[PDB]
PDB file of C-alpha atoms in Angstrom:
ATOM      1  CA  UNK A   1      89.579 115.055 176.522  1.00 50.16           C
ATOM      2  CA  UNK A   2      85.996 116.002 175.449  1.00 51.91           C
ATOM      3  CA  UNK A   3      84.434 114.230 173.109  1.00 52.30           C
ATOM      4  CA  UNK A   4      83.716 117.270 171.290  1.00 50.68           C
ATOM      5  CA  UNK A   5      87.465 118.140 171.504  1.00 52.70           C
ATOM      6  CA  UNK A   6      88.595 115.183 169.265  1.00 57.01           C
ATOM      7  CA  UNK A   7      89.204 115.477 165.187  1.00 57.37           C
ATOM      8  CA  UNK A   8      88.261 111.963 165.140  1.00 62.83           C
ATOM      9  CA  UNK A   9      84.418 112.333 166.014  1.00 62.04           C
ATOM     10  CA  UNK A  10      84.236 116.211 164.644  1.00 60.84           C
ATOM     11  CA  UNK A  11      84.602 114.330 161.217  1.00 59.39           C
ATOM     12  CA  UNK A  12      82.687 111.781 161.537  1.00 60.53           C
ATOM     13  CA  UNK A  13      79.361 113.818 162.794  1.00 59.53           C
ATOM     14  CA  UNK A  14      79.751 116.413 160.473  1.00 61.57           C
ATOM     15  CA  UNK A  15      79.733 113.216 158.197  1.00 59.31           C
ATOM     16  CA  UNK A  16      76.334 112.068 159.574  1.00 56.76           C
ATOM     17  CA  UNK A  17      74.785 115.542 159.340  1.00 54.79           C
ATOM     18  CA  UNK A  18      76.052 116.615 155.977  1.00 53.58           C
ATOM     19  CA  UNK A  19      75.112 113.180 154.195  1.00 54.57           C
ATOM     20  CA  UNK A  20      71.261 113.370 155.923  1.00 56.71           C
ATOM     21  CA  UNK A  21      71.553 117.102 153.645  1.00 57.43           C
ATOM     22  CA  UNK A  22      70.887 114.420 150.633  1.00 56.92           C
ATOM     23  CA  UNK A  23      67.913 112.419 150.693  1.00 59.39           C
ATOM     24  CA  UNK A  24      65.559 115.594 149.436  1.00 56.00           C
ATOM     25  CA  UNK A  25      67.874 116.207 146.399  1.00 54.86           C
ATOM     26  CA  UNK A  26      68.723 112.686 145.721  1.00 56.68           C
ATOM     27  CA  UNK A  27      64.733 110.868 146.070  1.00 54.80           C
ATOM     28  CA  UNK A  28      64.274 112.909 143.260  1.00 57.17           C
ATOM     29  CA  UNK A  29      66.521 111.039 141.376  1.00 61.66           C
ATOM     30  CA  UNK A  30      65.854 107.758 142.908  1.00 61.77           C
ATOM     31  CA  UNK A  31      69.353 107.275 143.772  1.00 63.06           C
ATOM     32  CA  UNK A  32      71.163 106.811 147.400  1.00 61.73           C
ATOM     33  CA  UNK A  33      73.699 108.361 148.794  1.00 60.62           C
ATOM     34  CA  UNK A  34      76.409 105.913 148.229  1.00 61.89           C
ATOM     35  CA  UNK A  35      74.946 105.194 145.018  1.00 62.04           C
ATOM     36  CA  UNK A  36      75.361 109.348 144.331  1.00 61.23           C
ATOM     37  CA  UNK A  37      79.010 108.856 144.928  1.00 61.98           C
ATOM     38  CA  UNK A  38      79.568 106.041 143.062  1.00 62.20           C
ATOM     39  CA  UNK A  39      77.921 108.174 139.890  1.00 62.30           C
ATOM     40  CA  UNK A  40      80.162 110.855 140.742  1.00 62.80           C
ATOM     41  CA  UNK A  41      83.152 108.439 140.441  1.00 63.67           C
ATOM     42  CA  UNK A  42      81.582 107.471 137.102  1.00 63.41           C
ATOM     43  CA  UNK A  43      80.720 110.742 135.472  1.00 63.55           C
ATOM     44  CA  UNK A  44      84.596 110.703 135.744  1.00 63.42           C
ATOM     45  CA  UNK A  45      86.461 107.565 134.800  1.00 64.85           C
ATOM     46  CA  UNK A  46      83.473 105.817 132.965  1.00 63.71           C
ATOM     47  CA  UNK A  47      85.180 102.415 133.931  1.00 66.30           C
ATOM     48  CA  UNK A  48      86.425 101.018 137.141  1.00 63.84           C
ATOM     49  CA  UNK A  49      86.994  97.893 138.627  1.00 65.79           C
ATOM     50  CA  UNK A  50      85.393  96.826 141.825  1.00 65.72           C
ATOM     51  CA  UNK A  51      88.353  96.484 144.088  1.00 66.87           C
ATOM     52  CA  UNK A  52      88.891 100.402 142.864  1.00 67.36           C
ATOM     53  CA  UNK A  53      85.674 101.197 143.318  1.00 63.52           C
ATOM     54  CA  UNK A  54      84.825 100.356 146.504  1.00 64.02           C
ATOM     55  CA  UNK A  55      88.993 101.255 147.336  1.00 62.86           C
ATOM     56  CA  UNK A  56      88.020 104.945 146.859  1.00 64.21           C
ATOM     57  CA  UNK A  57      84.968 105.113 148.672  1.00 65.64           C
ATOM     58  CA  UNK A  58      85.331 102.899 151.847  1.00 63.89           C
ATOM     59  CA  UNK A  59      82.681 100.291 151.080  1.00 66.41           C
ATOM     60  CA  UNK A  60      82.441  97.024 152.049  1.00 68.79           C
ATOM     61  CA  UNK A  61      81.518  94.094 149.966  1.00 67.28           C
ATOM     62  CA  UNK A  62      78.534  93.775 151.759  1.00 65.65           C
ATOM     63  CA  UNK A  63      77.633  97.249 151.037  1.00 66.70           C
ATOM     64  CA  UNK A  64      78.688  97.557 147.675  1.00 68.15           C
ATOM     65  CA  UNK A  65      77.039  94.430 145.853  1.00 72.18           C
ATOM     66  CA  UNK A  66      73.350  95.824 146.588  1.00 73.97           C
ATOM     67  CA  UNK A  67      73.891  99.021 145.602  1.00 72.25           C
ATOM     68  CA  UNK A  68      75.627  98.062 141.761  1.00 70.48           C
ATOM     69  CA  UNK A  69      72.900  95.328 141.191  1.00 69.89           C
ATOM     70  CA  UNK A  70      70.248  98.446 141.655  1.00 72.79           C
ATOM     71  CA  UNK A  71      72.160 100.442 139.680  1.00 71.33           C
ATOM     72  CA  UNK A  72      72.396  97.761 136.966  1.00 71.04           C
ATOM     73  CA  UNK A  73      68.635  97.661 137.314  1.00 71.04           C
ATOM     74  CA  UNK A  74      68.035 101.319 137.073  1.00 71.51           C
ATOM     75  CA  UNK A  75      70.245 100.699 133.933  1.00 67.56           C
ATOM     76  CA  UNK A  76      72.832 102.990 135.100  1.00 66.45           C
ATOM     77  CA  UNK A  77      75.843 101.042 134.914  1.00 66.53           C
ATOM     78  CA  UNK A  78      76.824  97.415 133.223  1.00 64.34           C
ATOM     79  CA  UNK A  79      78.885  94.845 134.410  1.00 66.56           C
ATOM     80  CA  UNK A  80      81.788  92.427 132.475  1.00 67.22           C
ATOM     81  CA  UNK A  81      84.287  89.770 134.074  1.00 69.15           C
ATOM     82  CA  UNK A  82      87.924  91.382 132.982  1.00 72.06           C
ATOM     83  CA  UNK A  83      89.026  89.474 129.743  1.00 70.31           C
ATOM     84  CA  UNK A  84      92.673  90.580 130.745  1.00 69.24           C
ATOM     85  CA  UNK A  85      92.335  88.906 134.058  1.00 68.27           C
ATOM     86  CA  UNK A  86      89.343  87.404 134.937  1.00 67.91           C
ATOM     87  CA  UNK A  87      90.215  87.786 138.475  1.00 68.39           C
ATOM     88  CA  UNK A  88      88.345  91.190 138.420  1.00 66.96           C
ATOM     89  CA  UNK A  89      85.092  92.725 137.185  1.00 69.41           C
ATOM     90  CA  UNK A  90      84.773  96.355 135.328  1.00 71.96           C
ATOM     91  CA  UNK A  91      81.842  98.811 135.609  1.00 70.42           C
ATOM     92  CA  UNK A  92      80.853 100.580 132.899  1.00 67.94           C
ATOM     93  CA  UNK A  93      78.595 103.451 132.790  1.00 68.36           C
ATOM     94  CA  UNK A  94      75.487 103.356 130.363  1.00 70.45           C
ATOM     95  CA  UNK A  95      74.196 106.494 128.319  1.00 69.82           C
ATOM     96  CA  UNK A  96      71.697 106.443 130.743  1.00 70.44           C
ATOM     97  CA  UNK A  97      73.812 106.796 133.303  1.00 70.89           C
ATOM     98  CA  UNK A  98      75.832 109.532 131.719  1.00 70.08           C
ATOM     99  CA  UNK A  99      72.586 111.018 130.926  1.00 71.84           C
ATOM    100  CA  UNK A 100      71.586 111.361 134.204  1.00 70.90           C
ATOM    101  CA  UNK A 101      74.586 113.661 135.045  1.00 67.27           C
ATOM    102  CA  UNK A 102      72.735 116.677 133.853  1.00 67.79           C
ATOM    103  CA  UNK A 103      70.422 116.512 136.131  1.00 66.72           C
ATOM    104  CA  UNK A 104      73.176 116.406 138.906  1.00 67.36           C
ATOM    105  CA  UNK A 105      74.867 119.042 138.352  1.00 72.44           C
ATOM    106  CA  UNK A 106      73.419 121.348 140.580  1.00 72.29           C
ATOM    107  CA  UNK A 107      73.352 119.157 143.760  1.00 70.56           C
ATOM    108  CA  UNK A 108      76.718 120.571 145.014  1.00 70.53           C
ATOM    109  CA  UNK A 109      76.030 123.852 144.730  1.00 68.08           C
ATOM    110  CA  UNK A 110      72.416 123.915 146.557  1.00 68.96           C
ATOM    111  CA  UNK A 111      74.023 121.400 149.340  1.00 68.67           C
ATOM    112  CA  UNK A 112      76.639 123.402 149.733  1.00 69.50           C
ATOM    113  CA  UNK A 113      74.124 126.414 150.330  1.00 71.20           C
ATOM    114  CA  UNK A 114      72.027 124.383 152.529  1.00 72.07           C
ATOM    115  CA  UNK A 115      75.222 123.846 154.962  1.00 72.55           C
ATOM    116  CA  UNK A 116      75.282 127.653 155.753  1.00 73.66           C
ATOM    117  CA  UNK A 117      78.875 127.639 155.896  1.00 76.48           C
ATOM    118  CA  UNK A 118      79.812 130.102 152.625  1.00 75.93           C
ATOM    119  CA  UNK A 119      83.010 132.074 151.165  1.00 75.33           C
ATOM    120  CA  UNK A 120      86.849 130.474 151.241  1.00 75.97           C
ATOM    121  CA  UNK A 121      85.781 129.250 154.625  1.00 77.30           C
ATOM    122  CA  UNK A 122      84.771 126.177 152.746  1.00 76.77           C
ATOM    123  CA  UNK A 123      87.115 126.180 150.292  1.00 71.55           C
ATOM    124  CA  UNK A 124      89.977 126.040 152.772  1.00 73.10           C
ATOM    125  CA  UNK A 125      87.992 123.649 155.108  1.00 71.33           C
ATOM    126  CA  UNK A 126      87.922 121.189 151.823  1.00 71.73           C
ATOM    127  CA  UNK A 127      91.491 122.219 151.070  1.00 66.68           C
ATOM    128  CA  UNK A 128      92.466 121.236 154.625  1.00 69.53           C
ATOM    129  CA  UNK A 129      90.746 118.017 155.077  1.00 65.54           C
ATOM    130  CA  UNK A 130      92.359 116.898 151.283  1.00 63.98           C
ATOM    131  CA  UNK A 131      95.684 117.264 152.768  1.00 64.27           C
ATOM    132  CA  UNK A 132      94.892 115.569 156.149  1.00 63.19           C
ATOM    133  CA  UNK A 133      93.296 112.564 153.641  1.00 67.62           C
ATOM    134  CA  UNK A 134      96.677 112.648 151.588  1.00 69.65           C
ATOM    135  CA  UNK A 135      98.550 112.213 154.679  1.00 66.28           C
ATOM    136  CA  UNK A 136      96.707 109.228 156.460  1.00 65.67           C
ATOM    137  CA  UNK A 137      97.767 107.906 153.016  1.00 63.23           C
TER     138      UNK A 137
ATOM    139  CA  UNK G   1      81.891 117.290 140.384  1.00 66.26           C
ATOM    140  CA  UNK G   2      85.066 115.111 141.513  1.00 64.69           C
ATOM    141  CA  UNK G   3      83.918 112.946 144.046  1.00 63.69           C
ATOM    142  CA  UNK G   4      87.136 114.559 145.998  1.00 62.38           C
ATOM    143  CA  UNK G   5      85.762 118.217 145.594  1.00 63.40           C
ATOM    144  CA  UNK G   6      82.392 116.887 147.700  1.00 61.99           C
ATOM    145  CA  UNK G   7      82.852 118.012 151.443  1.00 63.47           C
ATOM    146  CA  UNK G   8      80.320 115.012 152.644  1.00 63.23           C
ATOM    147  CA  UNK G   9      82.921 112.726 151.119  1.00 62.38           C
ATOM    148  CA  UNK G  10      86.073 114.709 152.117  1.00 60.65           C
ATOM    149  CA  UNK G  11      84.243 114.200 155.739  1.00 66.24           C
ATOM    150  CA  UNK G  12      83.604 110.678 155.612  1.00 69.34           C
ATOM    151  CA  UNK G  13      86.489 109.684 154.401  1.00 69.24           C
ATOM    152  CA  UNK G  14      89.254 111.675 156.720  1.00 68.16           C
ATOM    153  CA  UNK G  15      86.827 109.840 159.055  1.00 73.73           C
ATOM    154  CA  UNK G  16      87.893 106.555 158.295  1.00 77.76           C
ATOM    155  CA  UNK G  17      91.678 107.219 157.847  1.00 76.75           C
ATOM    156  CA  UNK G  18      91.763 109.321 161.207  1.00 77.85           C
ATOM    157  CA  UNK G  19      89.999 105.955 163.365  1.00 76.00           C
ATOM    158  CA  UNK G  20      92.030 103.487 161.797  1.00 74.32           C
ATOM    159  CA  UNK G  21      95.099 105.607 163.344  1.00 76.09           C
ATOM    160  CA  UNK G  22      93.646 104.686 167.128  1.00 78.68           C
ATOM    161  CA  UNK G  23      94.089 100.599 166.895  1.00 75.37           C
ATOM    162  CA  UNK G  24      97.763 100.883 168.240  1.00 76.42           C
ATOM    163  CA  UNK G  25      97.201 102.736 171.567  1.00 77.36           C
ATOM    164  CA  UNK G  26      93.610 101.471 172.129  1.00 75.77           C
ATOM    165  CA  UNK G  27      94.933  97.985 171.817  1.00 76.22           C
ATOM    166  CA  UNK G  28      96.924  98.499 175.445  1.00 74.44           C
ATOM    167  CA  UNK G  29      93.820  99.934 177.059  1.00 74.30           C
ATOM    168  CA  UNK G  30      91.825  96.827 175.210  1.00 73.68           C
ATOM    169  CA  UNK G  31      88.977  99.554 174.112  1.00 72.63           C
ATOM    170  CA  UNK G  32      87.493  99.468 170.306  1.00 74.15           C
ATOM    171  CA  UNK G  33      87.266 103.367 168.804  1.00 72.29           C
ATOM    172  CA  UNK G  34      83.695 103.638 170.208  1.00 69.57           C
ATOM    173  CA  UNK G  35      84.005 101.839 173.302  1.00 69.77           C
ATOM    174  CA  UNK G  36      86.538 105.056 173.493  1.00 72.08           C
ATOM    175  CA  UNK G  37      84.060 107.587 172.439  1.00 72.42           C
ATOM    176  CA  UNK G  38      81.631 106.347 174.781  1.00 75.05           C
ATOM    177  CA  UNK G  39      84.070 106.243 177.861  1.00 73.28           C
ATOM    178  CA  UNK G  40      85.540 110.245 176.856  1.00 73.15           C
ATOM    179  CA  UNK G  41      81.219 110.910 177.357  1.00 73.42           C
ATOM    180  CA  UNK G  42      81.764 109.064 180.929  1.00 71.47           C
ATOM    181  CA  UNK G  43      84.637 110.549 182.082  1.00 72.47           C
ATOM    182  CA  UNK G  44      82.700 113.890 181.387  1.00 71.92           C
ATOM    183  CA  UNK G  45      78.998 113.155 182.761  1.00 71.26           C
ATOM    184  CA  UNK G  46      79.409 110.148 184.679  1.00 69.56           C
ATOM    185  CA  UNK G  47      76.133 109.221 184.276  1.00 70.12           C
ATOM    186  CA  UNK G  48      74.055 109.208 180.736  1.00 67.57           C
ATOM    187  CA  UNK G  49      70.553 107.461 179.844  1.00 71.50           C
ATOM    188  CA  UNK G  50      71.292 105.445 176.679  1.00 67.60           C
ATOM    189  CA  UNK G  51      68.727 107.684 174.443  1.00 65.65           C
ATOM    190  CA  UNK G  52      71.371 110.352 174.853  1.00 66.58           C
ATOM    191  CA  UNK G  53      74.680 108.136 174.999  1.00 64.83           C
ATOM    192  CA  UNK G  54      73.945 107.058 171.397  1.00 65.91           C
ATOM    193  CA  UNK G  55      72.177 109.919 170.128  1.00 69.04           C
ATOM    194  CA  UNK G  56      75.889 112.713 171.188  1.00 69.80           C
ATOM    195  CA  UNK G  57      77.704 109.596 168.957  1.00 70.30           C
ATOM    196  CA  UNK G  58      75.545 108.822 166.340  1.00 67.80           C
ATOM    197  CA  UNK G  59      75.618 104.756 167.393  1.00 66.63           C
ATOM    198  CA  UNK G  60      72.505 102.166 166.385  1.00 68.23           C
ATOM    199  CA  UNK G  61      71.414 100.435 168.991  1.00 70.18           C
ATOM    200  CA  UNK G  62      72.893  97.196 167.014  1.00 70.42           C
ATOM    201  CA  UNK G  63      76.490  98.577 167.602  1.00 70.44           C
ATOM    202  CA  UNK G  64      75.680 100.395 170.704  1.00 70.34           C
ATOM    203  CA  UNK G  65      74.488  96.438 172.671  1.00 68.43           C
ATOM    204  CA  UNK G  66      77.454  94.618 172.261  1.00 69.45           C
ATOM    205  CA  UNK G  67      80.045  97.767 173.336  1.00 67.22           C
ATOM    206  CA  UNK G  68      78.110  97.790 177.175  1.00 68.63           C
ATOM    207  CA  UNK G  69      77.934  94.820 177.015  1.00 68.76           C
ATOM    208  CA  UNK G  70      81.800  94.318 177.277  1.00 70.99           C
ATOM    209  CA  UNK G  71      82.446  97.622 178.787  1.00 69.87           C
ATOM    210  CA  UNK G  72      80.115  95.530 181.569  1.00 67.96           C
ATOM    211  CA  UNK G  73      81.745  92.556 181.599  1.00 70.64           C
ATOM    212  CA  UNK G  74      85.018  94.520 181.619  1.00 72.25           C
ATOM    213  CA  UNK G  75      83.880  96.215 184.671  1.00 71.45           C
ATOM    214  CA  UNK G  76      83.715 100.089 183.214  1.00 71.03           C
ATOM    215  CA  UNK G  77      80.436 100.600 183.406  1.00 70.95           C
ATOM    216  CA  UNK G  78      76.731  99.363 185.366  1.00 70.19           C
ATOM    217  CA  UNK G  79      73.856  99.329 183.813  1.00 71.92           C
ATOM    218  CA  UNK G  80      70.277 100.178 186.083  1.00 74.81           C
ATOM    219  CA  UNK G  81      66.837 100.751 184.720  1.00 76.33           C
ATOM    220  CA  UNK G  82      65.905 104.282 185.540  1.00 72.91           C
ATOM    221  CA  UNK G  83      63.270 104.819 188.865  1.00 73.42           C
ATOM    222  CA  UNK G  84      62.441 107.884 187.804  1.00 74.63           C
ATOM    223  CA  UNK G  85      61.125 106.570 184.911  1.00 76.23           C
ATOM    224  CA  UNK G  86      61.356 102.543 183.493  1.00 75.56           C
ATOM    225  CA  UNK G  87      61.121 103.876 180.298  1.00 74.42           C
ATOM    226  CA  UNK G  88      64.958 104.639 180.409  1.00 73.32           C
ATOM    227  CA  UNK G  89      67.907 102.813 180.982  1.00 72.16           C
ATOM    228  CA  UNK G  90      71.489 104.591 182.506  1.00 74.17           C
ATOM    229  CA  UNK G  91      74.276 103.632 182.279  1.00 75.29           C
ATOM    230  CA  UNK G  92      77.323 104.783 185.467  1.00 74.50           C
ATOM    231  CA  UNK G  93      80.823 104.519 185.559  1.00 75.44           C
ATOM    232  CA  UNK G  94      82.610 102.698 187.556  1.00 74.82           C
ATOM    233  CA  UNK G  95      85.587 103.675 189.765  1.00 75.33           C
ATOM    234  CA  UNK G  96      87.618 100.961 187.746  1.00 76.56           C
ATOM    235  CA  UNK G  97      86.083 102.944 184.411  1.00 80.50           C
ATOM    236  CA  UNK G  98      86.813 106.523 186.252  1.00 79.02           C
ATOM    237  CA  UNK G  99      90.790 104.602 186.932  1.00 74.80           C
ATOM    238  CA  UNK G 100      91.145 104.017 183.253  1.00 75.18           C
ATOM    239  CA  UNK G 101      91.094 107.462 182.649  1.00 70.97           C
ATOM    240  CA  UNK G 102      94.322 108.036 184.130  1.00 68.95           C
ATOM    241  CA  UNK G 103      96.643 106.168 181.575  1.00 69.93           C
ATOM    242  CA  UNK G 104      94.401 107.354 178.552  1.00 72.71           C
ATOM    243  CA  UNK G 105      94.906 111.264 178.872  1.00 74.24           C
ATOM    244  CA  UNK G 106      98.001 111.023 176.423  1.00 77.99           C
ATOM    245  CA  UNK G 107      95.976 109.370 173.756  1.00 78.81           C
ATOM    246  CA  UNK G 108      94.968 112.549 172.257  1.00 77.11           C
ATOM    247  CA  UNK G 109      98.432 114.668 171.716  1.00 76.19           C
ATOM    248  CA  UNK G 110      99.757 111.269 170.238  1.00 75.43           C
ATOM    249  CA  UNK G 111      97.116 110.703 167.366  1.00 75.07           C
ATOM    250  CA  UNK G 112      97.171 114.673 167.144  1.00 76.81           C
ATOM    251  CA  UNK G 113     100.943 113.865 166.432  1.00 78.25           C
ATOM    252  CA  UNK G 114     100.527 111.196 164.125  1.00 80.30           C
ATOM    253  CA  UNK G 115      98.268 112.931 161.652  1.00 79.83           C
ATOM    254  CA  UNK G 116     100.750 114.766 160.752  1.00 77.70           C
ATOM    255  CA  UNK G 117      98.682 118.143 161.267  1.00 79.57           C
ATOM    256  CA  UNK G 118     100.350 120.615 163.819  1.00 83.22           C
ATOM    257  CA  UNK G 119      99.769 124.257 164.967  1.00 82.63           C
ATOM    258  CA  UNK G 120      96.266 126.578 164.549  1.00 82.98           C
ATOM    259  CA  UNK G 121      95.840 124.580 161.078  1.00 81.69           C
ATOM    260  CA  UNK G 122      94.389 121.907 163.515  1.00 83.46           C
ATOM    261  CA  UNK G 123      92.208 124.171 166.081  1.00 84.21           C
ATOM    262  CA  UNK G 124      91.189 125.791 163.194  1.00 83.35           C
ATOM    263  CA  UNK G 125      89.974 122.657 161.866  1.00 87.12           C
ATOM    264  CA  UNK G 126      88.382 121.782 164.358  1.00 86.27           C
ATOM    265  CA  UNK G 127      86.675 125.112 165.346  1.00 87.86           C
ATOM    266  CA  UNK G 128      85.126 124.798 161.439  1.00 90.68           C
ATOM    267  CA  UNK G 129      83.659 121.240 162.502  1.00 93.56           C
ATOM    268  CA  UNK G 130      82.406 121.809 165.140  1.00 93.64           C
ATOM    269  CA  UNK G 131      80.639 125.045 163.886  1.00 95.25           C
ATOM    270  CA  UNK G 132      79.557 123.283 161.108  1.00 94.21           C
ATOM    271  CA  UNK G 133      78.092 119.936 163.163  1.00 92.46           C
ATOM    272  CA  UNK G 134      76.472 123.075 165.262  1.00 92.64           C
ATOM    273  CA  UNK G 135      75.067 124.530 162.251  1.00 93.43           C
ATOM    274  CA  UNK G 136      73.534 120.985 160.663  1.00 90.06           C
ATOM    275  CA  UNK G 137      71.609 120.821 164.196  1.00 91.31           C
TER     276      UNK G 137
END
């Protein structure tokens, strides 16, 4: 029963450590961490919803609204009530936002570099901790 | 780029949907998650300053209050400023915290069980973390 024997923490502090990997790479770019994933899920699928966006990502409300109205700021993304149900609100990506992407690109692979860990060992580590995701789901 | 390609998400994220699998058997026991983490450090050094107690857990001292705070109340733990030096405070268990113990060993091959994950895919996982976390410090 060592604390260092459960899955539970092992993921979580990895978490802490691999996230702190960031802040160099990202200050360049102004943006946050969270605010780095968000753009990731926005390079993708343009437009989301916030109960989406925050769904697939684990942020709270609390944590969410700052980070948007910066973003908005920045001019990164845009806001817009739903017209189909104006129980929700969309968030679209701006060309400056998109634009932004190309200086991205590279993050991953220098991160992934700066973790030390290198070959398939990380690409079935990732594979493995996709599945374990997919079945807490 | 997928945001579900990025190990620091991948991380996070199994985090999350690992803990919330704890709730039903730390409910008998009355323990939160890291009220739990904290007491598998106690029934392994018995006796930790609170520098290191949050730093081997990654806690803020804003969630790390509160949890001795019941665990005191509760009667797991005692708090005593250190003589050695007042600068530090550590914090003991108690034999009513040590007793606990006893009906908490089986927590671990249950959750183990209910992720789903069985075999060396799992202490493989694990020995990856862990090398990882070691690597990242």
């Amino acid at each position: 029963m060592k604390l260092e024997n459960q899955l539970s923490f092992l993921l979580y502090a990895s978490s802490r450590e691999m996230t702190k990997q960031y802040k160099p790479l990202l200050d360049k770019l102004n943006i946050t961490y969270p605010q780095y994933l968000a753009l990731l899920l926005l390079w993708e699928h343009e437009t989301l919803t916030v109960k989406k966006m925050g769904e697939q990502l684990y942020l709270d409300s609390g944590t969410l609204t700052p980070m948007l109205k910066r973003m908005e700021q920045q001019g990164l993304i845009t806001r817009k009530r739903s017209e189909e149900d104006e129980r929700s609100v969309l968030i679209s990506l701006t060309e400056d936002g998109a634009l932004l992407k190309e200086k991205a690109v590279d993050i991953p692979g220098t991160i992934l570099g700066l973790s030390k860990q290198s070959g398939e060992d990380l690409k079935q580590l990732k594979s493995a901790l996709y599945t374990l995701l997919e079945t807490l789901h």
